[PDB]
Amino acid sequence: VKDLNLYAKELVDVVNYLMKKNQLVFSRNNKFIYVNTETIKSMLEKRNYDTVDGKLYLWRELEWIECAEDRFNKRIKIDGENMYAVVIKYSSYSILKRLYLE
Amino acid sequence: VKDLNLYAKELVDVVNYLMKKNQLVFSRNNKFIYVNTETIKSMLEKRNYDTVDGKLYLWRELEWIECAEDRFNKRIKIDGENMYAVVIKYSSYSILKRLYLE
């Protein structure tokens, strides 16, 4: 429950799940990974070591995700869509994946 | 596959110890905690789950500490005096402390 590896592992697994489902959306510069808020919320409900908001709060505080002020998502423009999404930093995912694989 | 909790708990414990001993200096905006490099290195020697540099390298890669180029510390100003210090991000310490409390 109070195990940082669970949060770090979940971030790498979220990207792995989206890769597998062919739902992975990258920014144009490949700096960010965009995920639909409802998709993230249904995925973060699976592992009961914390709530959805507890997971998002920790990712935000550790700066693995980019958020708007007092929110868990940002407003982004991608392939004609100008709306809210959970913004995962590609650099953070790469660092955590490299750590997950050592 | 490193146990991130060892590194995270050690960051929290180091700050707590130094807070208690009044050996911490905060930045004016409370964004950073400044610690003497030798004090940090002496404390990081105690727990043998990694080397001092292995611990500092992980804190730097996860961005829990702010460093100068190819250094584990940074040059700063304290009451007009310029000196090197390990610069801990207060936000990183807060989330980790909250994680191991609740």
Author numbering:
A (entry chain A), B (entry chain B): 1 to 102
Sentences reproduced from the published study:
In the Gram-positive pathogenic bacterium Clostridium perfringens the conjugative tetracycline resistance plasmid pCW3 is representative of a large class of closely related toxin and antibiotic resistance plasmids. In this study, we have identified TcpK, a protein encoded by a gene upstream of the oriT site and tcpM, as being a major factor required for the efficient conjugation of the pCW3 plasmid. Our data revealed that TcpK was a distantly related member of the wHTH family of DNA binding proteins.
Four identical TcpK molecules were present in the asymmetric unit, each comprising four α-helices and five β-strands. These interactions are predominantly mediated through helices H1, H3 and H4. Interfacing residues in helix H1 consist of V1–N5, all of which contribute through an extensive network of hydrogen bonds and/or salt bridges.
